[PDB]
């Protein structure tokens, strides 16, 4: 059994420039449980990101939430970078506040 | 309140 991570990058609250918020990367549906997740700001890894306790769904696939406090701006670009044994290369998903 | 398990 090897299962590819689903990835969602999003903010805790609707994003408003200059307003403090939380940037989330939710990874789910993956197996095995070893996974690398980084939050990126303009391509640079953000320091001291936190994550939830390892848990799993009914089909036994794992999920984790990675998160950091951030204050969105007009020009700053955020993304989540994920590496897992099922991938050919680390996957980068951009944050799109207007989704 | 936690339970318990056995060896395989």
């Amino acid at each position: 059994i090897q299962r590819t991570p689903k990835i969602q990058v999003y903010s805790r609250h609707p994003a408003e420039n200059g307003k403090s918020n939380f940037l989330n990367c939710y990874v789910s549906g993956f197996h095995p449980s070893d996974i690398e997740v980084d939050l990126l700001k303009n391509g640079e890894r953000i320091e001291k990101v936190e994550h939830s306790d390892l848990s799993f769904s009914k089909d036994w696939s794992f999920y984790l939430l990675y998160y950091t406090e951030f204050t969105p701006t007009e020009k700053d670009e955020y993304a989540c970078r994920v590496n897992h044994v099922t991938l050919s290369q680390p996957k980068i998903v951009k944050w799109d506040r207007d989704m | 309140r936690y339970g318990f398990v056995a060896n395989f």
Partner: protein, 274 residues
């Protein structure tokens, strides 16, 4: 509605590091309330929501002992798996375990669980009757016969209809205002052209609890099936959840379409239109 208590534990062997990790997490419905991590310094069951801290010092002592017993036994079970499958300790492997119970809205016992997966696949599971097992393969059949001779089923049934249910009822009373709440979804819609002739309507639900929610699109009163995209429900990180549902519609026709939002905390469903 009805309520659940679940403990989810994951054991992973780590050749190279040399020593396996066991981590267990406890939930009531969609609210995590405890964790134990064999890698961590405390070597204690720890609170992960404030409502459980109504419990006294003896709770943390006893729960720590029980989860440490589980940790030892499942880490031993990884080694037993190696024997049953004729596998080398050179590889990393995963053993997942779930147990817990469901009660009704008035606390009545509904259902109990005690089940394992090895390397992502079912290994063994206690059946709904709480009196027999389903073994997924030859290895599991060895465990099944052993557990049958040792009457593990009766032991689990006793826990599941006793301690498990007693604990869950206790939590539902003590943490009543947290666990018996319904936070209804806050909703809005977005619109994205795909081409000159199709566009995406996306219906958003934010800030809701519990996690269960139904987002549906209909054109003129019937389903959309595989014309509708439903994303996995996700945590906001603050104890609430988020979800969206999307439909691709003919441009200029953003009105044959309605988003209906249905959630346990909504007296009446929502109806959204672009």
């Amino acid at each position: 509605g009805s309520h659940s208590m679940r403990y989810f534990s994951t054991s992973v062997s780590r050749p190279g590091r040399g020593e396996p990790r066991f981590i267990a997490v406890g939930y009531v419905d969609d609210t995590q309330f405890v964790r134990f991590d064999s890698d961590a310094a405390s070597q204690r069951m720890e609170p992960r929501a404030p409502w459980i801290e109504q419990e006294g010092p003896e709770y943390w002592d006893e729960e720590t002992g029980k989860v440490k017993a589980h940790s030892q036994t499942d880490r031993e079970n990884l080694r037993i798996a190696l024997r049953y499958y004729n596998q080398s300790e050179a590889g990393s492997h995963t053993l997942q375990m779930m147990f817990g119970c469901d009660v009704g809205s008035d606390g009545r016992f509904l259902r109990g669980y005690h089940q394992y997966a090895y390397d992502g696949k079912d290994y063994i599971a206690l059946k709904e009757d709480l009196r027999s097992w389903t073994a997924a393969d030859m290895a599991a059949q060895i465990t099944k016969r052993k557990w049958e001779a040792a009457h593990v089923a009766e032991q689990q049934r006793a826990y599941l209809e006793g301690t498990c249910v007693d604990g869950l009822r206790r939590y539902l009373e003590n943490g009543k205002e947290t666990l018996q709440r319904t936070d209804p979804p806050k909703t809005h819609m977005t619109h994205h052209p795909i081409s000159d002739h199709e566009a995406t309507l996306r219906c958003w639900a934010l800030g809701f609890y519990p996690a269960e929610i139904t987002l549906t699109w209909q054109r003129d009163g019937e389903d959309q099936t595989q014309d509708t995209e439903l994303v996995e429900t996700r945590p906001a990180g603050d104890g609430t959840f988020q979800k969206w549902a999307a439909v691709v519609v003919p441009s200029g026709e953003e009105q044959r379409y309605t988003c209906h939002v249905q959630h346990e905390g909504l007296p009446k469903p929502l109806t959204l239109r672009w």
